């Protein structure tokens with residue numbers, strides 16, 4: 001049982017990194033992987049960097065060099081569903097690209113040729129995460145998470161996403177790329193992130209302020225989830 | 231010296247593929263690599279699939295599994311510069327994402343955090359490509375190539391690119407993702423593509439019509455360039 005964990009930013013991986021025993025590091029392809037035991041569980045924790053390509057590169061390296069059994073994508077996210085507040089958890093049942101458009105060839109908006117329109121997250125991983133949410137008594141929303149190479153702060157950027165993906169519960173910049181890579185190698189995948197902002201209302205300022213809260217909450221979730229899978 | 235070559239589509243790699251001696255096929259992650267010799271020179275040719283993540287995944291696997299010394303990204307492109315006809319060659323001086331936006335945190339438009347705002351293509355590769363262009367007496371333009379996860383077909387997409395990157399000579403969907411991976415592994419990189427359309431309201435029709443011409447012209451250039459580098 002080796003669990004892969006991927007976060008984009010230093011701030012998102014630092015708490016999980018500090019809790020790894022017999023921690024060794026691989027710096028490769030401009031990313032970092034940290035290997036060891038987390039509460040006596042073998043894990044590979046990747047710091048990918050930001051955006052779709054960084055995440056895809058990182059995910060590929062992780063899968064190649066660490067051969068994890070599953071991948072959990074952790075970190076912050078912009079909340080779209082109205083029940084969500086800063087700190088709350090979001091769990092993917094599906095990921096889609098909100099910025100992909102080959103509709104001129106009759107693909108569905110969001111869909112890239114050779115891909116499904118959206119990528120289904122693993123039902124066992126989702127079940128596990130929902131049990132972790134009940135144990136910890138966290139507030140959480142399960143739903144479609146959308147990814148793009150844009151930081152969303154209201155206006156037409158947010159309106160476009162709500163028009164094209166009315167059911168999207170959160171927006172971010174890596175999850176669908178990781179899902180795409182995992183799909184291609186048939187590795188079970190799930191996103192377990194926490195809200196740093198509401199993708200509007202000066203989200204850049206909320207992000208500066210509440211990223212630490214979001215890192216702490218997703219970290220709590222991930223630790224518990226990893227324990228529960230082992 | 232082993233030369234890596236990356237194309238997105240079957241129609242873009244098929245002619246080069248058929249020229250490889252001692253050909254082996256590695257099928258992995260929804261991507262296919264063909265290794266062997268092209269007129270005596272060691273090559274590895276990737277069929278990546280379409281879009282940024284597909285290209286990032288494939289370039290990553292290509293670099294890891296084959297360790298090429300340079301990467302040439304080939305195939306078709308939507309022409310933006312004035313002096314470009316269907317069939318003409320475009321050569322990258324630089325690549326940027328046209329769909330990346332983290333301007334809320336002070337980055338330049340198209341720049342992702344932790345990356346340069348554009349990726350400089352290798353000067354020795356560019357020089358060789360240009361020598362080949364002259365040798366074969368082709369019409370070519372060297373300059374900024376922009377990538378995104380969208381097939382550009384006039385309207386907002388084209389308008390947005392011409393506004394944000396008035397100096398861009400062509401648009402496509404993989405090159406910058408490949409440059410990004412190459413940047414992270416310090417591998418020299420160039421784009422040598424051919425025009426299939428001009429990214430306007432009739433681009434989908436022109437692409438269907440002229441993909442084969444663009445594939446042939448890029449293939450001729452890449453075959454020539456491979457021997458020049460050899």
Ligand SMILES: CCCCSC[C@H]1CN(Cc2c[nH]c3c(N)ncnc23)C[C@@H]1O
Pocket residue numbers: 008009049050051075076077078150151152153171172173174196197198199200203207332335343
């Ligand atoms: C300070 C340097 C720049 C930060 S770019 C934002 C980080 C946080 N990630 C998740 C994320 C939270 N809120 C979001 C929003 N409103 N839009 C889109 N993504 C998000 C995506 C990306 O890795």
Ligand SMILES: CCCCSC[C@H]1CN(Cc2c[nH]c3c(N)ncnc23)C[C@@H]1O
Pocket residue numbers: 102105113238239279280281305306307308309380381382383401402403404426427428429430433437
């Ligand atoms: C299966 C049908 C879907 C094909 S999607 C377009 C292909 C061709 N590639 C280059 C390309 C030529 N013209 C373009 C344009 N107008 N916009 C953006 N990219 C291009 C990108 C991608 O690999």
